[PDB]
Structure 1
Amino acid sequence: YFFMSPCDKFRAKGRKPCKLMLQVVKILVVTVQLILFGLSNQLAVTFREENTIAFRHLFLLGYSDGADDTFAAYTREQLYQAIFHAVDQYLALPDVSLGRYAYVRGGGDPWTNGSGLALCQRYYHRGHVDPANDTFDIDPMVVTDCIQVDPPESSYKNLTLKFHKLVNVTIHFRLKTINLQSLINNEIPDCYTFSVLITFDNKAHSGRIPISLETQAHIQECKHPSVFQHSFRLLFDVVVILTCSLSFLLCARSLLRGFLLQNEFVGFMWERLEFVNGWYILLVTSDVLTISGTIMKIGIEAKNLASYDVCSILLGTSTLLVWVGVIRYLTFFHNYNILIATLRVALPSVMRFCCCAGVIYLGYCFCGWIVLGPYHVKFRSLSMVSECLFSLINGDDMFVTFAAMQAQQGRSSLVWLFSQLYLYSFISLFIYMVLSLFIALITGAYDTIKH
């Protein structure tokens, strides 16, 4: 038909395979670009993580590595000591810190003019809580009292906390640093502004106030730079864009020809989905994703985008798609095409059995959540329950799940017995039946392919 023919068969009675060469070049350039981008991102992420760890060690009183989710205050003296230690360490940073930092001094909403640190309470507008008469009268609206501290170059120790009506206490300040680590990977050093927020959280009003530290980095270009002796990335990005544009044009032209031929055939006869060649759909999709991600990456490197997650997702999805596309060349042979056809034949029944098993799985997920949420730390949220069950049907973390309920045998024996029955039934049903049926489906598809 000279259409739908295989490529080796076009070559026998036609032109050269000049469009299959373009695709492998696209795979090469996309992979190289992704690798380079990932290396640079690794460097930046390591810098930010190390700076945040140093900030925690400098500003959190009595902080040790690994005590992040449990780190909390339990007495009023503890809270006062933590707050004052954080402020004093802010005031002594140029003399005690191993890094080099600069003060920012306002220019924003939380901080007034000439103010570098903001110590602010947040409490209810009116709170009259007494448990002796079992009475209360609360106006929920949150009032903020902010204390401003000028960086060194007074009344922050006069702070009086409204403990019974407190919502949270927060400390806000920024630090300016220069990334000198970026020099090893060529490059010109960047200027980082770390926005540090320390939260003393009392929303639960349970007598336990967790303490956490978070940072938000804003990267700029340092004015007046000099490295005494110091385009490739931009040129490679435009090379990727040009190759992707050519691939998109060729695939679109091929799809248009296919649609025109389908229309001619349907006119002749006076199954339309068999004229589509979804490999080209995949190529076009990865093509658009690559182009969008490359523009976003160029902006990020030009320092005016700072949207790393979307660009990373776009480029990663495009790379995954272009690597999936080698199956197209693997089907051009026979001994690989038999396996690929086996998978293609097996897929629909696999999805249908996934529907049934997943309905049962959702039932088990809801039951496990509602029953073992109060007791099992692995069953707190619905997504956590789903992850636990999914890892449990694959033979992972089973004994810890059983032991976390053994640690309750003293408490409700009804709950312990229900947990035993639930876990045993679910694991047996999904290991001995569902996975075995998946294996049987694949084996049957392979048998039909061979026969």
Structure 2
Amino acid sequence: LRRRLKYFFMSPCDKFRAKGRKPCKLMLQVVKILVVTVQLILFGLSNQLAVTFREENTIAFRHLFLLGYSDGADDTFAAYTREQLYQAIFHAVDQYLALPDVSLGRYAYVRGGGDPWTNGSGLALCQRYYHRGHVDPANDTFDIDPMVVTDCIQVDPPSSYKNLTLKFHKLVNVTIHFRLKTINLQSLINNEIPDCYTFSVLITFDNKAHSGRIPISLETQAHIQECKHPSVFSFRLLFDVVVILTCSLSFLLCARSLLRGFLLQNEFVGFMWRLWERLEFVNGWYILLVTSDVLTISGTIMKIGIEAKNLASYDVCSILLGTSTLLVWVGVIRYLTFFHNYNILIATLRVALPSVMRFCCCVAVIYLGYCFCGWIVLGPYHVKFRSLSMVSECLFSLINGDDMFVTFAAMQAQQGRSSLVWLFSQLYLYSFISLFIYMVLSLFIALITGAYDTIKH
């Protein structure tokens, strides 16, 4: 049993010297790294083109349908008078009706086919208000039924919509919905058959705040299909099958290795009888390899489905493939651990990790207290403290010396208004930055240095 146990923990070189078995798994892992990286690169190259197409079409739509729109004004684009709102709505509808004659792109009208479009209708102009909405600020009185009533005009592609009358005092919002069909000719370069896009365009005039300011936004959804009857005067699926086969073989070999480890662990436990030490028979690198294989196979199946237009879950597929690629690239450290000089550094990090995590536990409570305090106190006055996630991002960036002066200057811009709040912000920011830069990061450095010193002895 001793010999088998010793050989089980032997390094690949020692195993080859002893039994001479060819290291199939190492070569398979190298090939897997290569093919997985190539597949990810190809997928990203293909997807960025579609992303660019959709983004450019959306920018063109914003310039076409939004009155007085200019680049970089998405956040602040709003209406402030009834005349402005009416003009914007009518401009959007008129530009929809004039699209064939003015647009640089080639778009087709989509009629009916569901809701909110009635049969034969291309554009739906809906206004949503309250069922009952009596409001009298002069007498501090109101009577509202929060139930929302929707009223839509239907415009067929080529003017009753010009008779629109908005109930401003009880208006919840206004929306314009339509769809445009186009063909992605940009696919010709990069050697792909053009596909058919349907853009669902929604223009929203939002009055949910009732603050006298109605923001205006335009959004698009892209539905991609294979064009019927294509006409233009295989190395994508074979590569996917190759990747799947490589991952399956790697999974089988790693599962065999893990089973062998489990059986040897059981034998050793039985021998000793006649948990931390049990899991010594577990090869975490092979767990990582199995996880990467599963993720890659799932992502490859999803990618095959997507590229045939049968699926539209690009986010999940991209996440799976990227995570698997990261895992396979991280797995290369196993090979470096077999050399003493590199193993020194890897073991330094490994022995540092536990105390680092314990110190993270110690620091998290202070960090969270600061987050809550900053959100509650500075949230009203600071744009960077409006949400707890935003507060955490701001504090994390401050800890690393980024955007410090702008954070100070935002509060400086309102020193005269509230002196108490300004003094509190001064104390809060100074104390947090000093504590976390001059004491916490220093202790991280000290922990790493101590781990390195221990490893070198």
Same fold (TM > 0.5): yes
- Residues in 2 aligned to 1:314 and 1:336: alpha-carbon distance in whole angstroms: 30
Is the contact made by 2:336 and 2:343 (CA closer than 8 Å) also made in structure 1? yes
Cα gap change, 1:277 to 1:334, in 2 (>3 Å)? same
Q: Deviations over 1:382-431 (max 9, x none)?
A: 00000000000000000000000000101100000000000000000000
SS, match of residue 144 in structure 2: strand
Q: Deviations over 1:194-240 (max 9, x none)?
A: 00000000000000000000000000000111111xx2100000000
Q: Deviations over 1:128-183 (max 9, x none)?
A: 0010110000000000001000001x200000000000000000000000000011
- Residues in 2 aligned to 1:14 and 1:22: alpha-carbon distance in whole angstroms: 17
Residue equivalent to 1:209? 214
SS, match of residue 232 in structure 1: coil
Shift in Å at residue 106 of structure 1? 1.1
Is the contact made by 1:119 and 1:170 (CA closer than 8 Å) also made in structure 2? yes
Is the contact made by 1:116 and 1:149 (CA closer than 8 Å) also made in structure 2? yes
Shift in Å at residue 8 of structure 1? 4.2
Is the contact made by 1:378 and 1:385 (CA closer than 8 Å) also made in structure 2? yes
Is the contact made by 1:2 and 1:10 (CA closer than 8 Å) also made in structure 2? no
Shift in Å at residue 18 of structure 1? 1.7
Shift in Å at residue 16 of structure 1? 2.1
- Residues in 2 aligned to 1:133 and 1:10: alpha-carbon distance in whole angstroms: 92
TM-score normalised by length of structure 2: 0.97
Shift in Å at residue 12 of structure 1? 4.5
Mean CA deviation greater in 3-12 or 167-176: 3-12
- Residues in 2 aligned to 1:198 and 1:6: alpha-carbon distance in whole angstroms: 63
- Residues in 1 aligned to 2:317 and 2:191: alpha-carbon distance in whole angstroms: 23
Shift in Å at residue 9 of structure 1? 4.5
Shift in Å at residue 10 of structure 1? 3.3
Shift in Å at residue 5 of structure 1? 3.5
- Residues in 2 aligned to 1:323 and 1:99: alpha-carbon distance in whole angstroms: 43
Shift in Å at residue 294 of structure 1? 0.2
- Residues in 2 aligned to 1:13 and 1:307: alpha-carbon distance in whole angstroms: 47
Shift in Å at residue 14 of structure 1? 2.7
Moved over 6 A (4+): none
Residue equivalent to 1:252? 255
- Residues in 2 aligned to 1:277 and 1:181: alpha-carbon distance in whole angstroms: 48
Shift in Å at residue 243 of structure 1? 0.2
Is the contact made by 2:384 and 2:390 (CA closer than 8 Å) also made in structure 1? yes
Q: Deviations over 1:251-302 (max 9, x none)?
A: 0000000000000000111911100010000000011000000000000001
Is the contact made by 1:11 and 1:17 (CA closer than 8 Å) also made in structure 2? no
Cα gap change, 1:2 to 1:125, in 2 (>3 Å)? closer
Shift in Å at residue 2 of structure 1? 4.2
1:324 has 2:327 as partner = no
Is the contact made by 1:197 and 1:214 (CA closer than 8 Å) also made in structure 2? yes
Q: Deviations over 1:283-337 (max 9, x none)?
A: 0001100000000000000101110000000000000000000000110111100
SS, match of residue 450 in structure 2: helix
Is the contact made by 2:12 and 2:23 (CA closer than 8 Å) also made in structure 1? no
Mean CA deviation greater in 349-358 or 78-87: 349-358
Shift in Å at residue 349 of structure 1? 0.4
SS, match of residue 169 in structure 1: strand
- Residues in 2 aligned to 1:446 and 1:407: alpha-carbon distance in whole angstroms: 47
- Residues in 2 aligned to 1:114 and 1:4: alpha-carbon distance in whole angstroms: 75
- Residues in 2 aligned to 1:76 and 1:349: alpha-carbon distance in whole angstroms: 63
Is the contact made by 1:7 and 1:17 (CA closer than 8 Å) also made in structure 2? no
1:39 has 2:45 as partner = yes
Q: Deviations over 1:74-119 (max 9, x none)?
A: 0000000000000000000000000000000111111000000000
Structure 1 residue aligned with 2:98, among 79, 82, 92? 92
Structure 2 residue aligned with 1:189, among 189, 194, 201? 194
- Residues in 2 aligned to 1:20 and 1:448: alpha-carbon distance in whole angstroms: 32
Shift in Å at residue 4 of structure 1? 4.1
- Residues in 1 aligned to 2:17 and 2:222: alpha-carbon distance in whole angstroms: 56
Shift in Å at residue 359 of structure 1? 1.0
Shift in Å at residue 6 of structure 1? 4.1
Is the contact made by 1:71 and 1:212 (CA closer than 8 Å) also made in structure 2? yes
- Residues in 1 aligned to 2:302 and 2:17: alpha-carbon distance in whole angstroms: 40
Cα gap change, 1:2 to 1:374, in 2 (>3 Å)? closer
Residue equivalent to 1:441? 447
Is the contact made by 2:202 and 2:220 (CA closer than 8 Å) also made in structure 1? yes
- Residues in 1 aligned to 2:83 and 2:9: alpha-carbon distance in whole angstroms: 81
Residue equivalent to 1:145? 151
Is the contact made by 2:293 and 2:324 (CA closer than 8 Å) also made in structure 1? yes
Shift in Å at residue 11 of structure 1? 3.0
Is the contact made by 2:183 and 2:196 (CA closer than 8 Å) also made in structure 1? yes
Shift in Å at residue 15 of structure 1? 1.5
Q: Deviations over 1:313-367 (max 9, x none)?
A: 0000000000000000110111100000000000000001011111100000000
Shift in Å at residue 13 of structure 1? 4.2
SS, match of residue 132 in structure 1: helix
Structure 2 residue aligned with 1:232, among 194, 218, 235? 235
Alignment of 1:24-423 (within 5 A): 24-152=30-158, 154-228=159-233, 231-269=234-272, 271-423=277-429
